[PDB]
């Protein structure tokens, strides 16, 4: 069907005008991506050093980077070799090229989730509604293998199997990993991944509002000084008759 279903507005902790992101939720959503979403989706523009000072310390992010193996080279014989990862390494590819993703995902290409709440209408609301909106198809419509019904996906036939259920991973802080909690955490993490400057942007905006609230009446007062020399000027016509 060509009819579309808009996702609703959720009360996010960063929804407000000066409201920053909850960094524990970004840490939990990074764990959700690492354990679930990294098998199919890529994060080509995010590195491990971006996690320092946001969700993890330097040594925690160093351990996270060294858990994986990165292709590197050329060696002195001219051959490629695996090495442990470091902080300057970006997040590992699931597939070496998109045609391998097409072959491994029944013809569908799992998109790079680095701008996925910036490239979709709804933002993180759309991601939450897509992850928590898998349901049985209604009567009249039928779907084949490799397809799953999702009313928030355009066309209502998504090639992605439902990846999140109750207790799909174990959190580091002991939070109960329900489907809604895991989806909210990964939506917060994807919002941070699309907008890493978000808290700094809102702090800059707060300083800008304070500075403009200081400076606009003062510049208005200077203008009205230099113009109130003219705005009380009185004229008189005195013809000699």
């Amino acid at each position: 069907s060509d009819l579309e279903l808009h996702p609703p507005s959720y009360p996010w902790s960063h929804r407000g005008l000066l409201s920053s992101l909850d960094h524990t939720s970004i840490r939990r959503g990074f764990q959700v991506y690492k354990q679930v979403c990294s098998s199919c989706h890529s994060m080509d523009y995010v590195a491990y050093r971006h996690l320092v000072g946001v969700c993890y310390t330097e040594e925690e992010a160093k351990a996270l980077a060294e858990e994986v193996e990165v292709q590197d080279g050329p060696n002195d014989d001219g051959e490629m070799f695996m090495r442990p990862g470091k902080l300057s390494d970006y997040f590992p590819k699931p597939y070496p090229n998109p045609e391998a993703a097409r072959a491994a995902n029944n013809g569908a290409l799992p998109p790079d989730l680095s701008y996925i709440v910036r490239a979709r209408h709804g933002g993180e609301d759309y991601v939450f509604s897509l992850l928590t909106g898998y349901c049985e198809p209604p009567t009249g419509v039928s779907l084949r293998e490799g397809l799953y019904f999702n009313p928030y996906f355009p066309g209502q036939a998504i090639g992605m199997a439902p990846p999140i259920y109750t207790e799909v991973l174990e959190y580091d802080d002991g939070t109960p990993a329900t489907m809604s909690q895991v989806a909210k955490d990964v939506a917060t993490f994807l919002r941070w991944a699309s907008e890493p400057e978000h808290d700094h942007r809102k702090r800059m905006g707060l300083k800008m509002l304070l500075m403009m609230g200081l400076l606009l009446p003062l510049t208005y007062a200077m203008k009205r000084h230099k113009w109130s020399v003219l705005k009380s000027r009185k004229l008189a016509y005195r013809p000699p008759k």
């Binding site: 000066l18 920053s20 960094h23 524990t24």
Partner: protein, 60 residues
């Protein structure tokens, strides 16, 4: 008894060079005070959410 703007004019605002000096000194002091106040407002709006609020839990 002169008032505060009158004494501010007599000591600082008359000469243009002293006007520039008090503008520069007030600029640096206002910069320090304004960054401190605006920052404190920003963590007061978003307490328990920034990295410096949850930073003590993970550092060893």
């Amino acid at each position: 008894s002169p008032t505060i703007p009158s004494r501010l004019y007599s000591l600082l605002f008359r000469r243009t060079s002293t006007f520039a000096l008090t503008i520069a000194v007030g600029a640096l002091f206002f910069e320090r005070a304004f960054d401190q106040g605006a920052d404190a407002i920003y963590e007061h709006i978003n307490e328990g959410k920034l990295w410096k609020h949850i930073k003590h839990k993970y550092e060893n």
